[PDB]
Amino acid sequence: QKGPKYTPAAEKPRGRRKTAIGYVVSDKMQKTIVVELEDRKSHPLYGKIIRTTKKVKAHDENGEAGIGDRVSLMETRPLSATKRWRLVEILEKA
Amino acid sequence: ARYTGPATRKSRRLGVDLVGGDQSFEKRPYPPGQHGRARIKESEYRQQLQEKQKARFSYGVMEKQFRRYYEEANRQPGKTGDNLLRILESRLDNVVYRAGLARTRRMARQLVSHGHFLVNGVKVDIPSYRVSQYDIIDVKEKSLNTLPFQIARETAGERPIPSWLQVVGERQRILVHQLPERAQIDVPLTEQLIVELYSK
Amino acid sequence: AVKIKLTRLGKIRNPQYRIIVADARTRRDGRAIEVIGRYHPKEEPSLIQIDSERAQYWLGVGAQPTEPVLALLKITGDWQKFKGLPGAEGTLKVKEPKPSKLDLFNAALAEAE
Amino acid sequence: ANIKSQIKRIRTNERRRLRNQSVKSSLRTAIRGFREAVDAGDKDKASELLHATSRKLDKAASKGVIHPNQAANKKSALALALNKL
RNA sequence: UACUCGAGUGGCGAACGGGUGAGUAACACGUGGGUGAUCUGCCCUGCACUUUGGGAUAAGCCUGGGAAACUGGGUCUAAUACCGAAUACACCCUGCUGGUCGCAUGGCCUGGUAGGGGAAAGCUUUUGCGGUGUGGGAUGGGCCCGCGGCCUAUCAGCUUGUUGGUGGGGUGAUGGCCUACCAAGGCGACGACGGGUAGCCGGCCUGAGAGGGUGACCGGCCACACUGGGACUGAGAUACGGCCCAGACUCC
């Protein structure tokens, strides 16, 4: 009665990462762009639907995105300070 | 703590005879004091207050206990007044008085307090014990032969017992079916005012 | 080390324990991982109840019972199931059932009449 | 230092710090030797002593003086520098 | 004598448990995610082992310095204390190279191959306990993020490692975390930067409810240990009953 020497690792579903859609308003850095996100949150008390804007700094290696483009992003591990986002593909150019 | 003061006094003030068979109420139906003869202005608070006074001073419960009972009954799904009266009629002292072994509620209170009774074989000497369904109430041997208990049990031809209580044996055994409903409590006075006072 | 413990509950005079799985560094009344059973020593047969499946899983993982927990496990046969010496023997002495209130009701009716 | 075992711990800690300090300084000296040799630019010597410094990194991580991952990082940087130069 | 055991060397513990709410308006807390960016002693379960050599010292004995605290020298001894080497090829690097999944760096197939390398320890005969490398669990963490919960423009501009890029350094890990160069950026009326106050929550009190107030007990996190800095040992350190320095205070 002798068993295997190596036990395979356990299978885990690889994690879901947040996705973001937005407009590029500052393509003026090196390899990094600044993009806002839209959301519709109901006011905690009054209940009126309120839109707010959040600026986000992403990293694009090739510098392929111009200023004012509808873009998609995903969450990433920190690449620098203030940089937790990445450019995947320029969804709609303008 | 119990109340020890005179009993016909509170019936006098409250306008309703509580013990039932005394002569003092009839020979003095008016409220006590120097100015018990004075004409009194009417007030809804006076009505609701005196109603509670009749209920509590008929049953013996104190204000904190009665308020807790009211909160319990209001929490209960039934109508608040009905739940009130059935809870206050589930007390051991009231059950004993109703079964006839006590000539009065004070009799029942003291006779339960001194541990002359036992429910389901356990020596229960507390008056505020609430009788549940299917309880068998018996007496202990030392109290079975004692002179006043014997007198009361042998001469027991007074007021009839209700349906849910039933005395069955010469040993003065008590047995209960169900918690009473508003027809079977059949104590005087009214419940709506009791409820409104605490709803204030 | 992850261990299987007991935690105090209940009032001053009568302790009532939960068979619990926690880390050794946690405090007795601290946070728990899984409530596995219970133990009331204040009763004549000393009520004991335990989830056999979760007990077996945790033991297989590597949990280490404390002495009272091991005694309980031996009583309920889950330790014996895990190891395999006698086999899963139920040594539990269940609470003696109490005669029904309605049955005493009818018996009293019959005796008095 | 009020309790007995903790005084004993003071003594043992001083001893352990002396030992670890010696080992760390030896590793540091060997790394500096390599760095100077490669910045000078002699691939032969760089290799012959890179082997030695790598052994020292591994057998210093083997005593618990430094973490295995740190030893791996240092070997990686060392070999990358030599290979590139 | 070794039943037994003062002091001593060596392991493990001492980072848990217990206390307080000073500080902190902050990823500190609550909730929900990520880690293809990560560590984890003791516990459980597989695989492979556990070879050979060596110097010294505490304790003891002799002696000195000191009021004390403590401490210097000689001589002497042991180990699961310390230090060499052989093997590991499951591990770590470097080079070449295949397949596959992607969420881009990239991951996974103990991929294949070539080169270099990485350890161990014995005691006890009694329900017998240990040691090393490595695969996998469980546990306990670290780091990053969305959203949420105070007052005050009679506080409008703030920021120069500050924002970003490359090479090096560092860490368990990514990252201006640090550094050299280059670009001149980054945050702000959806209130930056200031000022005041305050541990946060599960919960508690009130109220028909929404809401208002609050954070007593019990429970989970966080911060701190006379004040202010610092690192060492360690799997793990705000190290309350540890160390070093500078202070205020008490004592010899």
Swiss-Prot record, chain A:
Similarity remark: Belongs to the universal ribosomal protein uS17 family.
Signal sequence annotation: none
Protein name in the entry: Small ribosomal subunit protein uS17
SUPFAM superfamilies according to UniProt: Nucleic acid-binding proteins
Its job: One of the primary rRNA binding proteins, it binds specifically to the 5'-end of 16S ribosomal RNA.
Gene Ontology biological-process annotations: translation
Subunit structure: Part of the 30S ribosomal subunit.
Cross-link (Isoglutamyl lysine isopeptide (Lys-Gln) (interchain with Q-Cter in protein Pup)): 93
NCBIfam families listed in its UniProt record: PRK05610.1 (NF004123), uS17_bact (TIGR03635)
UniProtKB/Swiss-Prot annotation, chain B:
PANTHER family for the chain: 30S 40S RIBOSOMAL PROTEIN (PTHR11831), SMALL RIBOSOMAL SUBUNIT PROTEIN US4M (PTHR11831:SF4)
Subunit structure: Part of the 30S ribosomal subunit. Contacts protein S5. The interaction surface between S4 and S5 is involved in control of translational fidelity.
Upper lineage: Bacteria, Bacillati, Actinomycetota, Actinomycetes, Mycobacteriales
GO biological-process terms attached to the record: ribosomal small subunit biogenesis; translation
Region (Disordered): 1-41
The keyword Ribosomal protein is annotated on this UniProt entry: yes
SUPFAM superfamilies per the UniProt record, alphabetical: Alpha-L RNA-binding motif
Protein name: Small ribosomal subunit protein uS4
Record-linked HAMAP family: Ribosomal_uS4_B
Source organism: Mycolicibacterium smegmatis (strain ATCC 700084 / mc(2)155)
Stated role: One of the primary rRNA binding proteins, it binds directly to 16S rRNA where it nucleates assembly of the body of the 30S subunit. With S5 and S12 plays an important role in translational accuracy.
Swiss-Prot record, chain C:
GO terms for biological process, alphabetical: translation
Gene Ontology molecular function: structural constituent of ribosome
UniProt keyword terms in alphabetical order: Ribonucleoprotein, Ribosomal protein
Domain of life: Bacteria
GO cellular component, one term: small ribosomal subunit
Family: Belongs to the bacterial ribosomal protein bS16 family.
UniProt name for this protein: Small ribosomal subunit protein bS16
Lineage, uppermost ranks: Bacteria, Bacillati, Actinomycetota, Actinomycetes, Mycobacteriales
Gene name, Swiss-Prot/TrEMBL: rpsP
From Swiss-Prot, chain D:
Residues in the signal sequence: none
Similarity field: Belongs to the bacterial ribosomal protein bS20 family.
A molecular-function term among this protein's GO annotations: structural constituent of ribosome
Key words, A-Z: Ribonucleoprotein, Ribosomal protein, RNA-binding, rRNA-binding
SUPFAM superfamilies noted in UniProt: Ribosomal protein S20
Annotated region (Disordered), positions in chain: 1-21
UniProt cross-references to InterPro entries, sorted A to Z: Ribosomal_bS20, Ribosomal_bS20_sf
Basic residues biased stretches: 6-19
Keyword set includes Cell division: no
GO CC terms, sorted: cytosol; small ribosomal subunit
GO terms of biological process kind: translation
Top-level taxon: Bacteria
Transmembrane segments: none
Its biological purpose: Binds directly to 16S ribosomal RNA.
Name this protein carries in UniProt: Small ribosomal subunit protein bS20
NCBIfam families, sorted: S20
One Pfam family per UniProt: Ribosomal_S20p
Coiled coil start-end: none
